[PDB]
Amino acid sequence: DNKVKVAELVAEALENLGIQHAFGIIGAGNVHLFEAIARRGYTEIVCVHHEQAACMAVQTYYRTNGRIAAALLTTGAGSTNGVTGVVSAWADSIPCIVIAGNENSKFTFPENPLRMWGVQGYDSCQMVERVSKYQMRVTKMERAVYELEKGVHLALEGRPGPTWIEIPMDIQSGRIDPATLEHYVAPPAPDYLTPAVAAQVDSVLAALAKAERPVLWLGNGIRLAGGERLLKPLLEKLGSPALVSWAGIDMLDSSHPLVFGRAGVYGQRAANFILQNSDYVLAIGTRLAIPQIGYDLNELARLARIDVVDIDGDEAIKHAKRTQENIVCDARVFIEALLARLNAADAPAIASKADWVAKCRAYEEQFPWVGAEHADPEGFINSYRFMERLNGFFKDDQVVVTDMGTALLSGHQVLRFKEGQRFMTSTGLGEMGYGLPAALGVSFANDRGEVMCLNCDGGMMMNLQELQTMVHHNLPIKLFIFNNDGYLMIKHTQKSLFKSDYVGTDRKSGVSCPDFSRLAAAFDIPAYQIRGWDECDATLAKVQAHTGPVICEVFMHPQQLFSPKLGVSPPLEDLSPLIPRDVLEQAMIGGMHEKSKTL
Amino acid sequence: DNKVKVAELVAEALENLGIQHAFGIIGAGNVHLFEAIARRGYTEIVCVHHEQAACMAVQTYYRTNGRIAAALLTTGAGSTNGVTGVVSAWADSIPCIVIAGNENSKFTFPENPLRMWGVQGYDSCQMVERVSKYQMRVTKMERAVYELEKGVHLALEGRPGPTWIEIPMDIQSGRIDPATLEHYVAPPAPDYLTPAVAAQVDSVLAALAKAERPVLWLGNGIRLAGGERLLKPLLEKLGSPALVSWAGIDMLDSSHPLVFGRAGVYGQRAANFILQNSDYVLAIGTRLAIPQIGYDLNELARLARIDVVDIDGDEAIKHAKRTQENIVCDARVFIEALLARLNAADAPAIASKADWVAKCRAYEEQFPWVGAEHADPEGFINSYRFMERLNGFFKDDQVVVTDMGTALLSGHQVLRFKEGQRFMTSTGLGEMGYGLPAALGVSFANDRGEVMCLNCDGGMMMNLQELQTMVHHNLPIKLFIFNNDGYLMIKHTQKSLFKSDYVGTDRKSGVSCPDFSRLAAAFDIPAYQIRGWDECDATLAKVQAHTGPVICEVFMHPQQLFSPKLGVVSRTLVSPPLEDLSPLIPRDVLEQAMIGGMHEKSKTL
């Protein structure tokens, strides 16, 4: 009897694929995979308390060190509970594979006329058909490992994303001669640097040499391409200021002489002025999503030509009405091809950008990230000022993950990072409850490493159960919670629209949150409280000095503003609270926009 | 200017449709609908802390008094977080309507080449396309009220289930003349009593009158059809025994002289013997799922003809190799037609079933629901005995919801119910974390009424956040939690298959649960613990007497067995017939219990 259990071959395959961590919850649909993976001992199974957390953890697990993780779900609700995490990785272009069990293969076919498959199953491939790069149900034992190798390769190729491999129970418990195991041969990797693309790189180098006010917009597509180490020599060789997207903040030192912050609808005042006054914009690995460019392409950088570099052809041309060179290429290959042509024999002379770099620094001197608009409201701690203070307590290898709301906004608008530090969050989908599962992924990726989690009273509730997972494994997760009496982000939304009482956003309107210090005690978690500047520095030093999990509530004003912000619809440079008109006129090269004259 | 905001017309439409409660979470995608509904003041919006709980609560909300509820979800994650709830209503045939927001309609179309829509949207309709009765994206303002009326009707029509209506952002904020609103008119209900179906009823009546050992298998389809009050006059006019499915337990008093429990894979020993020894079985409103009939139709009631009644044509004929009359008819209409023919002057003579009824009672005598197999193991309270003790503390209008695990199995195998009591849970999907959201829907359905939630240490974690919703509204939800060091139900699974150390099912294998009493104290919820029988009655009395939410931990053996149960037995391995539940009774006892003698499989065990 020379036959091996299919589940055992899958566990072996996972080792050969380098997958060292798997997140999920056990069930009858994958009890054979849990057994086989455990008995092999190579892949550690982290058991979560909601399958949604397993499909979110695998994301930041990969973003940490570049090793893919698997989510191990079971039949029925085990799979539907993970859909949210799949959609976030789909939207942030993060690779990861889901291995979901199901009923016996005799029930798993779409032609089934019944509402449900077997006892409690369903077509888990059809549900994520439009939010994952690949989905396959294994109906032959001999192709179980095949689809896992294929699922992993497709998750990592091109624009990364999640893949969904469903294996019915009976396929897991089956036995076959290991010799009959099929294996997936990945096709040859594409050569993006075609003669056409190579000519676009030439056109970009001619504009950079000629541009007097260039601005490079760098995005996480660079880090995903493994070319973040090429940014420091590129900017210094070009002498061109650079902006970073919220997702690619940690690719460069925020204090680098040519890095001038983040622009967008929630961008920094000096960053938006730099972007809107440029004469040439070169986006590399950034999606130029709506929160980055506003709501009107004709109002974006009204003095500049805009070139876009993106490995997704659909993303690269979505702004074609406004952009010129739409370069469909890998970010690393493009940067290397641009750095080569800078040393070519016929490399053009790069015109000086000194006057532009000086005007960029003037903008930052005129509009600091934490300005007067961020004054302590009625004595409360101002989140933006708290982020500036917390910044000084970052360790040399600090990893910061955030949820939505105050943590997201205040974090990405103030916090600075240097090489060795990382900043992560889910911005594509922007789902609440991503902070905690994000910290689990980073922690296990660094062998139970330290992680700082900036969270909110509202977002803490979506995956509140993962505190138990944090305690069970003694993860050194420093969890900051911003208390503001509910959904502060939505308070401003409905107050701008209706100018009436709050609805479903605070305790009076039907949304309340528990005392997280008292929950921390229940979970055996040390907890601190920062209500004012008096105990601020002494507390932050203790939180960073802890070796195990710790919670720290930060109390802010329940109606503190989020600023700077583009709000009601002026141009992108005219952020609220509006600056006096005579000052905006002087800050804009060709004068202010006609919309801003009567505001 | 005679124009009205679309969202305000939606709020008006919800009032005309009778929807008085809406569960969900606010977001930019539905902020306009939150505002319009709140300002109108007819539909109460219940804010939950995870959209999943919203799509679950609307189910038990409807099952309580028959009033449909709406789930109000927002763009992106707001919609995805509710998919689990949709599938569970889809699987249990429970009507409900999801109202989901999305990005501006200019992004919301399937031909969009980009991975996402606008800022963070997606095709929420396609995602529930195979687990919902109807999906539509409102693209014209004049059709917003039309699709909600249509959505509600299709949810209640025929075999009930969830519907998904997506209303883009700009469609909610739009303004139109109320006179331009289109309105959906429901077609006339189908008349199921064709000559062909009337001939089936006559065939069923002819078998019932002749059968010596009949058994009616009543399911929740009867309650969904609104004919559960016809069951008493039907059973007493036929004099036949009857079994109830887990979903339809509360349709008849468990102590009625002719109701003999529930059968299946986790059925009661007495009920399985009554099923397997009958000569005629009439299934009405029950789906005859796999946990009910076993794994081989050729072993189900081998001496009996089987007829099935079900409003869904596919569910009605899925056992056509084994069944005889497959009647596709509404459960109430069928029962009315069967009563009309029983009360007729020309009604046929019903042969006496007295000897069979007597044999059914003897089965309950020899096999009580809580038997010697349920002794207290190693100084722990047995969950089956606890349920029998807890049963005595039910209120006259008690409502019991359950999670999975021990609460589900020990609950449905022991608990008895009277007229006016209710018993709900998710059995089609069987998801963990259904208990708390289930107690929310029942509570709000009865004007913040009292609900008993039988939960578990594991299932509590999925929707743990809804403890805040419970304290916020001061809901009198009595929450029992069975502590057994993890996933006891999976422990028995992996112990049967591998007979080795546990994996991902207890503290040592990677799954731990918090001290729910301490956790309760954090949420300002009074908490009690039941470890022995000495403090049991006093604690149960204090839990029931409270006015607000209560938590009560019940500590059981971390490896207690779930029995009776149809499990695999090593002879080679054998899956015994349905009547041979584990732990196995002596063969000579099983022989005497089977009218025709034991099955060939049972002789070697």
Ligand SMILES: Cc1cc2nc3c(=O)[nH]c(=O)nc-3n(C[C@H](O)[C@H](O)[C@H](O)COP(=O)(O)OP(=O)(O)OC[C@H]3O[C@@H](n4cnc5c(N)ncnc54)[C@H](O)[C@@H]3O)c2cc1C
């Ligand atoms: C409320 C809110 C406010 C926000 N405000 C701002 C703001 O003010 N400013 C701001 O900048 N962002 C802001 N964001 C975030 C922004 O909208 C996006 O979500 C994203 O974070 C922008 O960074 P990115 O383009 O690098 O990320 P992504 O959207 O992940 O961009 C990755 C891009 O790179 C491409 N790519 C992937 N792999 C490769 C490869 N190998 N080679 C080349 N390309 C590749 C992908 O196809 C994709 O187009 C906000 C988000 C929210 C939710």
Ligand SMILES: Cc1cc2nc3c(=O)[nH]c(=O)nc-3n(C[C@H](O)[C@H](O)[C@H](O)COP(=O)(O)OP(=O)(O)OC[C@H]3O[C@@H](n4cnc5c(N)ncnc54)[C@H](O)[C@@H]3O)c2cc1C
């Ligand atoms: C671990 C586990 C163990 C279980 N063990 C058992 C067990 O031992 N015994 C048991 O009985 N159950 C058991 N169940 C539950 C069982 O498998 C089903 O899930 C269900 O609860 C059976 O009850 P039901 O058919 O009434 O419910 P449903 O499955 O919801 O049945 C509803 C049926 O009625 C039909 N219907 C709907 N509306 C109408 C109408 N108007 N007119 C007519 N028909 C209509 C529907 O089409 C459907 O076929 C178990 C479940 C689990 C998860």
Ligand SMILES: CC[C@](O)(C(=O)O)c1sc(CCOP(=O)(O)OP(=O)(O)O)c(C)[n+]1Cc1cnc(C)nc1N
């Ligand atoms: C990302 C923004 C946004 O998505 C948006 O609609 O644009 C927000 S913010 C917010 C309040 C959080 O409030 P919080 O956490 O207390 O933070 P703040 O106190 O700092 O505001 C809510 C509810 N939603 C909508 C939303 C709802 N449900 C899920 C799962 N994801 C969501 N994104």
Ligand SMILES: CC[C@](O)(C(=O)O)c1sc(CCOP(=O)(O)OP(=O)(O)O)c(C)[n+]1Cc1cnc(C)nc1N
């Ligand atoms: C039908 C139950 C069943 O589905 C099954 O596979 O048969 C069970 S039971 C169980 C342990 C409960 O553990 P619990 O709550 O502590 O109860 P017990 O102490 O009584 O075991 C788990 C994990 N699962 C699989 C499962 C996984 N994930 C989600 C969301 N839903 C699920 N149903």
Ligand SMILES: [Mg+2]
């Ligand atoms: Mg348990």
